[PDB]
Structure 1
Amino acid sequence: QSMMKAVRLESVGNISVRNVGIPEPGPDDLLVKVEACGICGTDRHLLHGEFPSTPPVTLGHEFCGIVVEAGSAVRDIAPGARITGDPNISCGRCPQCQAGRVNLCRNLRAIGIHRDGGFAEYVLVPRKQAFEIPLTLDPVHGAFCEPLACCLHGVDLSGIKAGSTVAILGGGVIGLLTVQLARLAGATTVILSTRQATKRRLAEEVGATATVDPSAGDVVEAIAGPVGLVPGGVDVVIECAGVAETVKQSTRLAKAGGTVVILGVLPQGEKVEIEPFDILFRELRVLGSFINPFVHRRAADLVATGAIEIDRMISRRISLDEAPDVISNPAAAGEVKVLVIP
Structure 2
Amino acid sequence: QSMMKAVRLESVGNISVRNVGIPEPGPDDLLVKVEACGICGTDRHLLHGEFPSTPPVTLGHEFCGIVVEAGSAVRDIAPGARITGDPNISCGRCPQCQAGRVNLCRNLRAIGIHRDGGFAEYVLVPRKQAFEIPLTLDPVHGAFCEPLACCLHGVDLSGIKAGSTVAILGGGVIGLLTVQLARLAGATTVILSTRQATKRRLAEEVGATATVDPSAGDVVEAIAGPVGLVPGGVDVVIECAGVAETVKQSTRLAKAGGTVVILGVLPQGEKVEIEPFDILFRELRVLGSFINPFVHRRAADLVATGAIEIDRMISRRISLDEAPDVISNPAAAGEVKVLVIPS
TM-score range, shorter chain: over 0.9
Structure 1 unaligned regions, length at least 5: none
Per-residue deviation, 1:311: 0.1
Per-residue deviation, 1:222: 0.2
Counterpart CA distance in 2 for 1:70 and 1:158 is 39
CA displacement 1:242-298 (0-9 Å, x = unmatched):
010010000000000000000010111100000000000000000000000000000
CA displacement 1:131-175 (0-9 Å, x = unmatched):
000000000000000000000000000000000000000010000
Counterpart CA distance in 2 for 1:127 and 1:279 is 44
Counterpart CA distance in 1 for 2:331 and 2:272 is 26
Percent identity reads 100
Per-residue deviation, 1:333: 1.0
Counterpart CA distance in 2 for 1:242 and 1:133 is 31
- State the SS of the aligned residue for 1:103: helix
- State the SS of the aligned residue for 1:274: coil
Counterpart CA distance in 1 for 2:52 and 2:76 is 34
Does residue 191 (structure 1) correspond to residue 191 (structure 2)? The answer is: yes
Counterpart CA distance in 1 for 2:24 and 2:334 is 39
Per-residue deviation, 1:74: 0.2
Counterpart CA distance in 2 for 1:215 and 1:116 is 41
Superposed counterparts of 1:159-198, under 5 Å: 159-198=159-198
CA displacement 1:183-213 (0-9 Å, x = unmatched):
0000000000011000000000000000000
Matching residue of 2:307: 307
C-alpha RMSD of matched pairs (Å): 0.3
- State the SS of the aligned residue for 2:138: coil
CA displacement 1:5-62 (0-9 Å, x = unmatched):
0000000000000000000000000000000000000000000000000000000000
Counterpart CA distance in 2 for 1:256 and 1:122 is 50
Superposed counterparts of 1:142-291, under 5 Å: 142-291=142-291
Counterpart CA distance in 2 for 1:334 and 1:76 is 41
Counterpart CA distance in 2 for 1:285 and 1:60 is 34
Matching residue of 1:321: 321
**If the length of structure 2 is used for normalisation, what is the TM-score?**
1.00
Per-residue deviation, 1:127: 0.1
- State the SS of the aligned residue for 1:278: helix
Counterpart CA distance in 2 for 1:268 and 1:333 is 25
Counterpart CA distance in 1 for 2:67 and 2:141 is 16
- State the SS of the aligned residue for 2:35: strand
Counterpart CA distance in 2 for 1:160 and 1:243 is 23
| Count of aligned residue pairs for this structure pair | 342
- State the SS of the aligned residue for 1:147: helix
CA displacement 1:85-144 (0-9 Å, x = unmatched):
000000000000000000000000000000000000000000000000000000000000
Counterpart CA distance in 1 for 2:273 and 2:332 is 31
Counterpart CA distance in 2 for 1:28 and 1:128 is 8
Per-residue deviation, 1:223: 0.1
**If the length of structure 1 is used for normalisation, what is the TM-score?**
1.00
Counterpart CA distance in 2 for 1:159 and 1:341 is 36
Counterpart CA distance in 2 for 1:147 and 1:306 is 16
Counterpart CA distance in 1 for 2:42 and 2:139 is 23
Counterpart CA distance in 2 for 1:263 and 1:90 is 21
4+ aligned runs moved over 2 Å, structure 1: none
Counterpart CA distance in 2 for 1:331 and 1:194 is 16
Counterpart CA distance in 2 for 1:264 and 1:312 is 21
Counterpart CA distance in 2 for 1:243 and 1:134 is 37
Matching residue of 1:111: 111
